[PDB]
DNA sequence: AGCGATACGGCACTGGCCCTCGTTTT
DNA sequence: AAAACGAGGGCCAGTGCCGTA
């Protein structure tokens, strides 16, 4: 009730728009495809009083909202654009705090620069960071230069107090701060760390540059290479995200000079004061270039992204906030400890293996070793020079008692010793590495004159290329090797000859110990090359490999390590345990720098909501603080968030060490976070882009009917339906689907599905051939399918027809290509054109996949912006405290309070509903399906995570530490209206 | 189960043949050798460093072996509990705080009538009831970590969570011997019962300032058998397939290793400026590193003989002084972990040893 | 006197009210020791083992059982060292005369009913040929006397007495002046082979060791020192309106203590924790008085740190958080000095190393 | 026209510039 | 006695595989 899925709505009375012929074609298509076995399972309709609409449509609703939410900031930006610039001061003031430079650049001591808008670029001595040291900010009125307290030589103690720069004005509109990578500067603002607030928002010129004339990483790679027939036309219309480059692109003035010494990251605080004026000047150049770039970018951005939703969305997306406490420090210490322990064990075992294998140097018995014969095995003993002379060989030149009368013979032996000592020092010069030990052992050791010297062979690895060959047996064989690729593995007769000859002089290669090792292995070039495993003699070539890349080293083959082949020796279960150790510290190895250096400002009990103090938690001399995620507002593609740490933060896995990083963001007492994850966005997006193109309704496609049919709650989604084929649940099927939509390569889907399902290649290939029915079909000499009924003809002139191309049957890639064919904005819906470097006008463009992905992912990001502005609209209109936002592409979490969590979840549901209705309205009709209108899962708890129930590794016990629990949601939250008076 | 000959040949134990697993695990053994008591010495010192020194609020306690009121003490926990008040006075009633002591205990054993003594290192940790379990888990992880290092295979040492007959939580530590796991250290959380029984009169002298309030201290306790531990490291040090070539050597950690370096005389014979060996000797012992003197000798044999003799004694390095070194000043050196000849300078050798041990203590 | 009362309040001895007398201290009956006393004894035993490890050629450390092997507690520390003689003959390769040192807790009956007392003594059993036994006995006499003389504030306080009998041909006993009564501190006897020949008959062909192509059953030297009596000796030797114990720097339990001066601030605790770790990193015993919790006076604080025999007292004021300067204060001179916090470690280490002389 | 896509880092390995020292030169 | 050329090791940026969302 009715039309195969709709809810009670007041978003337009009319309406149909029937399309009888169109729906006849859709019905016939879905009959021959064919799907006509409806389950007839009506979802429980919801009757609630919707918030007041402003009219006429929801388009003008979101438009007016986004406009009134970004109006003061647009005003401030306009104040920056028409700003008449006063010249730089002749000298910079060396005083703490802010210094105003107005008429003729005089020095006027100021605590806080009171301006509507300004540019900003903060400096910070990395040598003892992460505390700000210098800052420069220009305004439409005059200049400002801020110095930190680092003007007096003391022995400071950095616990990250409220030392960051003060920028916000007190009450007892309003602010806008622009800058290149503005999030980094925001992180150094004094009043941005508070629980409440804030009025001040930020505008990033880097993100704006990315939105206007951005380029993909693949493009960046060959852009900087400038130092595929028409792939070099966009080279001068776009640039990399660097400040100098973006300035050379948008301003095109003289090349700004960068600091040649990199004193802020290479030097200490000492050499900074020696070059204070110069560094100040450089910072000024930076904020000035940033100013110009902004001035040139704002109108371009406003032109290319006309809808205000993107503007306000980008405004709220830049003011993220992560509250934390001492548990953060404890997490750091514990995780680092665990990591150091596991690494200690691993390196201990490996160096143990490396020590007992060094003994077979004497005498020349290493040549027999089928693993250790490639490396050095050197024996050095250098050096000395003659100075003593002459002509005499220096190479050969039981009595019981009780004497002690020679009391001072000890100091005689001592004197002789010291006198002998200080006469040999001038014989050598520079202490080289240990020559006695073989070369492979020298390389596997730290230098003697190294400040971080550890005894024995260090630098063991995991993932090196010497140690895996040092011990491991090789796939029912003996030797492993590397040249262009390591041991071949994972990611009508054929013959190949053989040969064996000697000529001298090369390294000796054994091949009998190999055969004998094979004999010992089966004690429990051809043949045995297909499925079994064996190594030849020399050659070296492929002669039976599946992967076209190689894998040094095998670090994700645990099921291929705990099933016999392959194994290690010596010996036992040391192999799979080593792989386990590698798997555990894999995350913390490539992230510990980002996590430990992740700064955090602790706010004192004087500058925090006293309503939290009233709440029965302090907690026991506990410190409460926070950290701003420091996120680039818009990075390719499309204008997604870009953050070094929190966007690549590992989930809750009982295997990984720092797997708790996500659940360490604990909300302050009295407060709680309420968030949600769209399930699913891009799939339903592609679905809509299909059905809206085919006809008017949402279920008039083969692909678009299955997306909005399944429920994740005690049911089966499309991803889950493909995961139960079987099939692998569930993320793998998601990768398979989303990988299929953006180019279902036959070998890619092959090795992928074969990697995830673990079976034989034939049946797998059958499954793929069954699943490749979706993309089929498609379009002198050519593919045997055209616009004509038959391809065979004689001298038939038809070059005017070979301009159409599109798939058939199930999928809807034709529309995704339709948006990828337009040489004009290509912006659905909304509705923002991107990159002068990917726009097919004056571009080959040969970047199709990136553009299909651009379409759907842009729909996803506009979905995100819509969610942001929608959530912001009813959070200020109603009494919902805590508006701070924390978004991760699909998911989005708001820092609310314990008494306004359910109404916030209700706000999330309303938001999702309105946004879905928006995507429905932008293509027609305004009507939308049932199992897609509202969220299915709403997380409401203290720390943020994936599922409501969370286990972990490092702290072992989650609730054992001071935590709580989560709550699934749901249908019980649909009883608390948006009005304050509930329950 | 064949390294016993190495323990007898090189005295880390008694030369008596009657040294069964039972006689060693019960503590009825005739005694340890000089290298064995030195190993145990360094092990106990390594305990004292990583338990008492670095961590504050932990003070040494001297408990008696007997009672004023014949059988001796079974555990040095009670004697430490008797020194609770006085040690509360020097800490100014600031708990959590602990008392550590390494003393020999006497255990009555019915051999299937005798009594076996064994050295134990115990730490009694007086901690508030609010944070008892937390300190239990803390000490569990840290003790287990302390034992899992110094080992060539840390996988052997394990832990076991167990409850009392009443419900008190506790943890045991095992080592995997060739015949199965064996208890080496035990940790328990006594619920202030014994302290309440010892002081029935005034319980006011038992209150400890938890912070903003004085509470009755929950008594945590960790007792570690250093004999079974010494034997555990002794087995762990000794080596196991397709190695193609085997050599007898026990790989003890350079920190707890009995003799650090071994000084000898090569080429041989050379008279009479060999008094430099004495210089290097006193110089070495002055820095607190163990050095074996190879002066008066009957061998006069293959170098492999005394090399294996030093490898059976887990000696880290073998420094060789010959006449060429008497000429220039570059003595020879043979590491145990990797048997390889290496030339080096004298004071450079001293500082290399000090740095070797110091860095071995680290990561 | 007024020394036994400052050993109770500063935790050198265990808590007692009746068994605190000198007669009960001289006896093995206890009320054992306090942390300061334990550390003092540990340092003393350490220096003992150091003053015999430098001795050529080689002396092997051993441990003897406490109870009777045949079913009881030990009186002397000789038998257990005689049991490991034949075994340690192999390690010395039967080459030269050699000894066995060991420090252990021996017992002795103290006299209602009679009880049992304990004492931690350090013994050395030096096996040496009969022709060169007396000379080596005089050698050990001199070396032990000098050993007690090094850490002594006064060499005249320690004395050496000679004696002999029918069982022991020649023996020497080391006394200590209190001066409430000279007491026994260490015994040096020259027992014959009778003690050793009694536990191995026979076939006594094992006992005789090589002495320059000569087989001879070695005479036994019995060194037996008391570390508790020595502890009390140095305690009375250090006691000097002032009440300060001036124990030897190499012997003193806690050699430095650092507090704060400025009001309770976290940064002060940070700096003091840093200095704490730095000082403990180079093996320097440091008393943490920065906990603290009040820091009342300074004179009674210095009095407390002088009654605990702390060499140097360190004060970390608020200026230290600017210049790094810190307030040192000696014990033997009580001179209020000031120096940078970075050069403190080197100063303490050099000062301790400067006390190494004989 | 043919295609996983958008990122974020990490460690292992390498050819090249630069400084130091010795073998070789008035 | 004095000028010159080659060998060795560190700092540098680039590249190939892998780590995560
Ligand atoms: N490899 C990979 N590539 C791509 O391109 N995506 C993107 C495709 S869409 C977007 C969100 O996906 P999701 O949130 O992880 O999943 P869901 O299907 O949106 O709904 P759920 O309920 O969570 O399953 O990420 C995601 C991938 F993982
Ligand atoms: P995480 O919780 O696994 O994922 C969070 C979001 C979903 C979309 C985005 N993402 C994840 C993985 C991949 N491969 N690509 C993405 O865009 O992160
Ligand atoms: Mg999703
Ligand atoms: Mg997602």
Q: Measure the CA–CA gap between A630 and A186, rounded to whole angstroms.
A: 8
Distance CA C350, CA C358 (A): 17
User: SS3 for B60?
Assistant: strand
The candidate with the shortest Cα–Cα distance to B234, out of B258, B260, B204, is: B258
Say how far apart CA C287 and CA C301 lie, in whole Å: 12
Mutate to test the interface with A, among B252, B279, B282 (most CBs of A within 10 A): B279
What tokens appear for B18 in the block? 């009657």
- Sign of the CA dihedral with B176 first, then B182, B184, and B186 last: positive
Residues C253-358: name the CATH superfamily.
Anticodon-binding domain (3.40.50.800)
Chain B and chain C share a number of CB contacts under 8 A equal to: 97
Judge contact between A112 and A174, C-beta under 8 A: no
DSSP assignment string, C301-318: HHHHHHHTT-SEEEEE-S
Contact assessment for residue B262 and residue A406, using Cβ atoms and an 8 Å cutoff:
no
CB proximity list for C82: less than 8 A, separation 6 or greater? C125, C195, C196, C199, C220
**Token pair in block for residue A505:** 């002089």
Nearest nt to the A225 alpha carbon by C1'? E14
Strand D nucleotides within 7 Å of a protein CB? 1-13, 20-23
Q: At what angle do helices A574-584 and A326-356 cross, to 10 degrees?
A: 150
b/e A108-126 (16+ beta carbons within 10 angstroms → b): eeeebbebbbbbbbbbbbb
Of B172, B80, B74, B184, residue with least CA distance to B126:
B80
H-helix or E-strand containing C199? none
Environment class of residue B102 by beta-carbon count within 10 Å: exposed (0-12), middle (13-18) or buried (19+)? buried
Q: Do A413 and B241 touch (CB under 8 A)?
A: no
The strand E neighbours among A residues 470-489, by Cβ under 7 Å, are 484-485
Known binding residues of A for a 2'-deoxyribonucleoside 5'-triphosphate are 677-678, 680, 682, 730, 734, 738, 890
- Interatomic CA distance for residues C177 and A690, integer angstroms: 107
A604 three-state secondary structure: coil
Question: How remote is the C-alpha of C42 from its chain's centroid?
Answer: 6
- Of residues A45, A59, A121, A617, which has the active-site annotation? A121
Residue ranges of A 426-485 with Cβ closer than 8 A to chain B: 427, 434-437, 441, 453-457
Nucleotides of E under 7 A from a protein CB: 8-10, 17-21
Which residue owns the Cα nearest ligand 1 atom 27? A735
Distance of CA B40 to the CA centre of its chain: 5
Q: CB under 8 Å, gap of 24 or more: what pairs does C269-278 form?
A: C270/A157, C271/A155, C271/A157, C271/C316, C271/C320, C271/C321, C271/C341, C272/C316, C275/C314, C275/C316, C275/C341, C275/C344, C276/B56, C278/C345
Strand partners, A134: A123, A147
CA distance A534 to chain B (A): 20
Decide if C62 and B15 are in contact by the 8 Å CB cutoff. Answer: no
Q: What DSSP state is assigned to residue A454?
A: -
Give CA–CA dist C89/C93, Å, rounded: 6
Query: What is each CA distance from C115 to A190, B67, B151, in whole angstroms?
Result: 73, 9, 45
- Residues 135-154 in B contacting A (C-alpha not used; CB under 8 Å): 145, 148-149, 152-154
Between the CA of A680 and the centroid of ligand 4 the distance, in Å, is 8
Q: Choose among A734, A732, A700: nearest CA to A718.
A: A734
Taking Cα atoms as reference points, which of B79, B63, B64, B68 lies closest to residue C114?
B68
Is A939 close to ligand 1, i.e. is its CB under 6 Å away? no
**CA–CA distance from C36 to each of A564, C8, C16, C41, C292 (Å)?**
61, 10, 16, 9, 19
**CB-neighbour burial class of residue C320 (10 A; exposed 0-12, middle 13-18, buried 19+):** buried
Quote the ligand 2 centre to A890 CA distance (angstroms): 8
Which ligand number lies closest to the CA of residue A681?
1
- Cβ burial, residue B289 (10 Å; 0-12/13-18/19+): middle
Q: Which chain A residues touch C267 with a CB distance below 8 Å?
A: 157
Q: How far apart are CA A912 and CA A867, in angstroms?
A: 7
CA A23 to chain CA centroid, Å, is 43
Q: Which nucleotide is nearest to A450 (CA to C1')?
A: E10
Give the Cα separation of A818 and A805 in Å (integer).
10
Q: Residue A60: CB partners within 8 Å, gap ≥ 6?
A: A54
* CB-based contact, B49 to chain A, within 8 Å: no
Q: Is the C-alpha dihedral spanning A294, A298, A299, A303 positive or negative?
A: positive
What residue ranges define each of the domains in chain A, with the CATH number in brackets? 88-153+165-304 (3.30.420.390), 714-791 (no CATH)
Q: Do B243 and A394 touch (CB under 8 A)?
A: no
Give me the residue from C135, C271, C322 closest to A402, CB to CB.
C135
Proximal ligand: closest to the CA of A717: 1
Q: Determine contact, residues C224/C121, Cβ cutoff 8 Å.
A: yes
Q: What does C60-85 look like in DSSP terms, one character per residue?
A: EE----SS-S-----SSSSHHHHHTH
Cβ of A679 less than 6 Å from ligand 1: yes
Residues on chain C touching B280 (C-beta within 8 angstroms): none
For A38, the 3-state DSSP assignment is coil
Residue A204 a catalytic site member = no
Q: Are A752 and A739 contacting, i.e. CB atoms less than 8 angstroms apart?
A: yes
Q: Each residue of B153-172: b (16+ CB within 10 Å) or e?
A: ebebbebeeeeeeeebbbbb
Main-chain dihedrals φ then ψ at residue B317, nearest 5 degrees: -125, 150
Burial label, B110 (beta-carbon count in 10 A; 0-12, 13-18, 19+): exposed
d(CA A320, CA A864): 14
Distance in Å, residue A591 CA to nucleotide E20 C1': 9
Hey, of A402, A409, A411, which one would you mutate to test binding to chain C, going by the most C CBs within 10 A of its CB? A402
B/e letters for A712-736, b = 16+ CB within 10 Å, e = fewer, are eeeeebbbbebbeeebbeeebbbeb
Strands (E), B178-300: 180-190, 208-209, 214-215, 218-225, 261-265, 291-294
Subunit contact B155:A577, Cβ cutoff 8 A = yes
> Long-range contacts made by residues A818-822, C-beta under 8 angstroms, separation at least 24?
A818/A693, A819/A851, A819/A852, A819/A855, A820/A848, A820/A851, A820/A852, A820/A855
CA atoms of A193 and A176, how far apart (whole Å): 17
* Residues C153-182: b if buried by 16+ CB within 10 A, e if exposed: eeeebbeeeeeeeeeebebbbbbbbeeeee
B243, B342, B363 member nearest A570 (Cβ)? B243
When computed from its CA atoms, the radius of gyration of chain B, rounded to whole angstroms, is 24
With contact defined as 3+ CB pairs under 8 Å, the chains touching C are A, B
- H/E element holding C284? none
Token pair, residue B152, equals 């060539």
Which nucleotide's C1' atom has the smallest distance to the CA of A552?
E17
Long-range CB pairs of A239-248, under 8 A, 24+ apart, other chains included: A239/A209, A239/A213, A239/A215, A240/A215, A241/A206, A241/A209, A241/A210, A241/A214, A243/A180, A243/A206, A243/A286, A243/A289, A243/A290, A243/A293, A244/A289, A246/A180, A246/A205, A246/A206, A246/A209, A246/A293, A247/A289, A247/A292, A247/A293
Atom of ligand 2 minimally distant from the CA of A857 = 17
Tokens representing residue A968 in the block: 């699934």
Q: Which CATH number fits domain B258-363: 3.40.640.10, 3.60.21.10, 3.40.50.800, 3.40.50.1820?
A: 3.40.50.800
Quote the crossing angle between the two packed helices A276-304 and A243-250, to the nearest 10°: 50
Resolution in units of Å: 3.6
Q: Give CA separation, B9 vs A597, B5, B15, C209, in Å.
A: 55, 6, 8, 19
Do the chains contact at A395 and B347, CB–CB below 8 Å?
Answer: no
Q: How far lies C307's CA from each of A597, C236, C249, C303, in Å?
A: 46, 13, 14, 6
Nearest to B282 among C54, C63, C83 (CB): C54
Give the C-alpha separation, A835 to A843, whole Å. Answer: 11
Alpha carbons B100 and B92: distance in angstroms, whole number = 18
Residues 6+ apart with CB under 8 A from A776: A807, A808, A809
- Give the span between the Cα atoms of A539 and A509, in whole angstroms: 12
CATH homologous superfamily of B1-238: Bira Bifunctional Protein; Domain 2 (3.30.930.10)
Number of CB pairs, chain A paired with chain B, less than 8 A apart: 112
A924 φψ region: left (φ > 0), alpha (ψ -120 to 50), beta (else)? left
Query: How many whole angstroms separate alpha carbon A365 and alpha carbon B145?
Result: 39
CA distance A331 to A762: 48
Q: Is the CB of A447 under 7 A from strand E?
A: yes
Instruction: Find how far residue A968's CA is from the centre of its chain.
Output: 27
CATH topology of domain C1-239: BirA Bifunctional Protein; domain 2 (3.30.930)
Q: Where are the domains of chain B?
A: 1-238, 258-363
3-state secondary structure of A420: helix
Q: In angstroms, rounded to a whole number, what is the distance separating the alpha carbons of residues A582 and A593?
A: 18
Q: Is A728 left (phi over 0), alpha (psi -120 to 50) or beta?
A: beta
Give A404's contacts in chain C (Cβ within 8 Å): 139
Q: Is A132 left (phi over 0), alpha (psi -120 to 50) or beta?
A: beta
The H or E element spanning position A176 is strand A176-179
Q: Which residues of B touch C71 (CB under 8 A)?
A: 114
Residue with tokens 């339990």: C253
Other beta carbons less than 10 A from residue A934's beta carbon: 18
Reading the block at residue A702, the tokens are 């083969």
- Kindly determine whether the C-beta of residue A220 is less than 7 Å away from any atom of nucleic acid strand E: no
Answer whether A400 sits within 8 Å of C139, measured CB to CB.
Answer: no
Sole residue written with tokens 């080689």: C58
């Amino acid at each position: 009730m009715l039309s195969r899925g709709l809810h009670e709505q007041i978003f337009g009375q009319g309406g149909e728009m029937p399309g009888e012929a169109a729906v006849r074609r859709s019905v016939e298509h879905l009959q021959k495809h064919g799907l006509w076995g409806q389950p007839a399972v009506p979802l429980p309709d919801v009757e609630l009083r919707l918030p007041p609409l402003y009219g006429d449509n929801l388009d003008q609703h979101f438009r007016l909202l986004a406009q009134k939410q970004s109006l003061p900031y647009l005003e401030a930006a306009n104040l920056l654009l028409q700003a008449q610039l006063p010249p730089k001061p002749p000298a910079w003031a060396w005083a703490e705090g802010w210094t105003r430079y107005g008429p003729e650049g005089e020095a006027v001591p100021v605590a806080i620069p009171e301006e509507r808008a300004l540019v900003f670029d903060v400096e910070v001595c990395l040598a003892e960071g992460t505390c700000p040291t210098l800052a420069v900010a220009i305004s439409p009125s005059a200049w400002y230069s801020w110095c930190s307290q680092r003007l007096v030589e003391e022995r400071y103690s950095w616990t990250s107090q409220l030392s960051p720069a003060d920028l916000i004005p007190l009450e007892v509109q309003e602010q806008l701060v622009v800058g290149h990578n503005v999030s980094f500067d925001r992180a150094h603002i004094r009043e941005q760390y508070l629980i409440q607030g804030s009025r001040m928002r930020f505008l990033d010129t880097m993100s704006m540059h990315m939105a206007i004339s951005g380029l993909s990483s693949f493009q960046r790679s060959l852009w900087i290479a400038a130092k595929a027939i028409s792939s070099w036309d966009w080279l001068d219309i776009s640039s990399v995200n660097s400040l100098a480059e973006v300035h050379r692109l948008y301003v095109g003035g003289p090349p700004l000079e960068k600091e040649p010494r990199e004193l802020f990251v290479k030097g200490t605080m000492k050499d900074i004061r020696e070059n204070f004026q110069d560094l100040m000047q450089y910072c000024a150049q930076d904020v000035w270039a940033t100013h110009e770039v902004f001035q040139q970018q704002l109108p371009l951005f406003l032109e290319r992204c006309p809808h205000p939703v993107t503007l306000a969305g980008m405004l709220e997306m830049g003011v993220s906030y992560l509250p934390v406490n001492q548990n953060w420090e404890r997490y750091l210490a514990e995780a680092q400890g665990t990591y150091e322990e596991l690494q200690r064990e691993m390196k201990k075992s490996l160096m143990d293996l490396a020590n007992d294998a060094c003994q077979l140097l004497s005498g020349e018995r290493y040549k027999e070793d089928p693993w250790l014969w490639d490396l050095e095995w050197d024996l050095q003993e250098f050096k000395q020079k003659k100075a003593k002379k002459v002509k005499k060989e220096p190479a050969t030149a039981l009595g019981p008692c009780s004497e002690e009368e020679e009391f001072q013979q000890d100091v005689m032996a001592r004197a002789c010793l010291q006198k002998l000592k200080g006469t040999t020092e001038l014989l050598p010069k520079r202490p080289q590495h240990l020559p006695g030990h073989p070369g492979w052992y020298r390389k596997l050791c730290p230098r003697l004159d190294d400040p971080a010297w550890t005894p024995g062979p260090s630098l063991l690895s995991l993932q090196m290329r010497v140690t895996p060959k040092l011990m491991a047996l090789t796939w029912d064989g003996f030797p492993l090797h590397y040249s262009e690729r390591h041991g071949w593995g994972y990611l009508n007769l054929a013959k190949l000859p053989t040969g064996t000859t000697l000529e001298s002089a090369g390294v000796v290669c054994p091949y009998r110990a190999i055969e004998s090792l094979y004999r010992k292995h089966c004690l429990e070039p051809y043949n045995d090359v297909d499925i079994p495993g064996c190594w030849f003699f020399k050659l070296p070539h492929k002669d039976g490999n599946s992967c076209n890349v190689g894998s040094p080293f095998a670090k994700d083959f645990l099921p291929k390590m705990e099933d016999g082949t392959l194994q290690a020796g010596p010996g036992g279960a040391s192999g799979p345990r080593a792989l386990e150790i590698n798997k555990m510290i894999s995350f913390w190895r490539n992230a510990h720098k980002r996590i430990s250096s992740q700064m955090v400002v602790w706010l004192p009990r004087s500058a925090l909501p006293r309503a939290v103090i009233r709440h029965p938690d302090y907690d026991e001399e506990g410190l409460y603080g926070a950290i701003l995620p420091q996120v680039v507002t818009a990075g390719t593609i499309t204008r997604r968030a870009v953050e070094p740490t929190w966007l690549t933060a590992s989930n809750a896995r009982p295997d990984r060490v720092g797997s708790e990083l996500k659940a360490m963001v604990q909300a302050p007492p009295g407060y709680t976070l309420v968030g949600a994850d769209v399930d699913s966005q891009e799939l339903w997006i592609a679905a809509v882009l299909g059905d809206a193109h085919f006809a008017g309704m949402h279920g008039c496609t083969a692909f678009g009917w299955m997306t909005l049919q399944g429920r994740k709650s005690r049911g089966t989604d499309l991803h889950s339906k493909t995961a139960t084929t079987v099939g692998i649940s569930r993320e793998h099927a998601k990768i398979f689907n989303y990988g299929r939509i953006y180019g279902a390569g036959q070998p890619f889907a092959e090795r992928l599905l074969m990697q995830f399902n673990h079976r034989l290649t034939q049946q797998e290939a059958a499954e793929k051939a069954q699943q490749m029915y979706a993309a089929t079909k498609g379009l002198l000499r050519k593919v045997q399918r055209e616009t004509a009924r038959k391809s065979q003809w004689k001298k038939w002139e038809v070059v005017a027809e070979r301009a159409w191309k599109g798939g058939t049957e199930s999928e809807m890639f034709n529309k995704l290509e339709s948006i990828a064919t337009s040489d004009i904005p290509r912006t659905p819906v909304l509705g923002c054109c991107i990159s002068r470097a990917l726009e097919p006008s004056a571009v080959q463009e040969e970047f199709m996949t990136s553009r299909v992905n651009w379409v759907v992912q842009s729909s996803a990001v506009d979905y995100l912006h819509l969610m942001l502005v929608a959530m912001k609209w009813l959070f200020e209109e109603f009494a919902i405290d805590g508006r701070f936002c924390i978004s991760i592409h699909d998911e989005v979490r708001y820092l609310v309070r314990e008494e306004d969590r359910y109404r916030a979840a209700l706000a999330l549901q309303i938001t999702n509903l309105l946004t879905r209705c928006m995507f429905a309205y932008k293509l027609g009709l305004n009507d939308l399906p049932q199992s897609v209108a509202f969220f299915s899962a709403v997380d409401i708890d203290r720390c943020l995570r994936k599922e409501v129930t969370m286990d972990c590794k490092t702290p072992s016990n989650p609730t054992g530490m001071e935590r709580r629990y989560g709550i699934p949601q749901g249908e019980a939250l649909d009883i608390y209206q948006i009005i304050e008076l509930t329950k | 189960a064949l390294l016993e000959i190495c323990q007898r040949r090189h005295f880390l134990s008694g030369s008596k043949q009657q040294l069964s697993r039972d006689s060693l695990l019960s503590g009825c053994h005739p005694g340890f050798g000089p290298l064995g008591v030195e190993l145990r010495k360094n092990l106990a010192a390594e305990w004292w460093t990583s338990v008492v020194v670095f961590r504050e609020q932990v003070f040494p306690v001297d408990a008696l072996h007997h009672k004023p009121g014949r059988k001796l003490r079974e555990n040095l926990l009670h004697g430490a509990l008797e020194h609770y008040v006085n040690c509360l006075d020097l800490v100014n009633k600031r708990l959590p705080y602990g008392l550590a002591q390494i003393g020999v205990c006497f255990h009555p054993v019915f051999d299937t009538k005798s009594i076996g003594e064994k050295t134990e290192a115990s730490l009694v940790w007086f901690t508030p009831p609010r944070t008892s379990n937390q300190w239990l888990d803390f000490w569990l992880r840290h003790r287990l970590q302390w034992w899992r290092k110094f080992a060539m295979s840390p996988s052997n040492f394990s832990s076991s969570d167990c409850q009392d007959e009443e419900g008190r939580k506790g943890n045991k530590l095992y080592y995997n011997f060739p015949w199965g796991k064996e208890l080496i250290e035990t940790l328990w959380n006594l619920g202030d019962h014994e302290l309440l029984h010892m002081y029935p009169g005034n319980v006011s002298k038992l209150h400890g300032r938890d912070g903003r309030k004085n509470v009755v201290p929950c008594v945590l306790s960790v007792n570690g058998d250093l004999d079974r531990g010494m034997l555990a490291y002794l087995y762990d040090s000794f080596q196991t397939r397709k190695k193609n070539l085997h050599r007898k050597v026990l790989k003890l950690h350079p920190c707890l290793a009995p003799i650090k370096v071994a000084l000898d005389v090569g080429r041989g014979p050379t008279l009479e400026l060999r008094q430099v060996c004495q210089g290097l000797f006193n110089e070495l012992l002055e820095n607190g590193i163990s050095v074996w003197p190879g002066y008066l000798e009957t061998m006069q044999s293959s170098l492999e003989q005394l090399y294996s003799k030093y490898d059976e004694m887990s000696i880290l390095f073998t420094v060789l002084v010959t006449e060429t070194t008497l000429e220039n000043g570059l003595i020879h050196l043979r590491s145990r972990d990797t048997t390889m000849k290496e030339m080096m300078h004298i004071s450079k050798l001293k500082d290399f040893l000090i740095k070797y041990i110091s860095s071995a203590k680290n990561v």
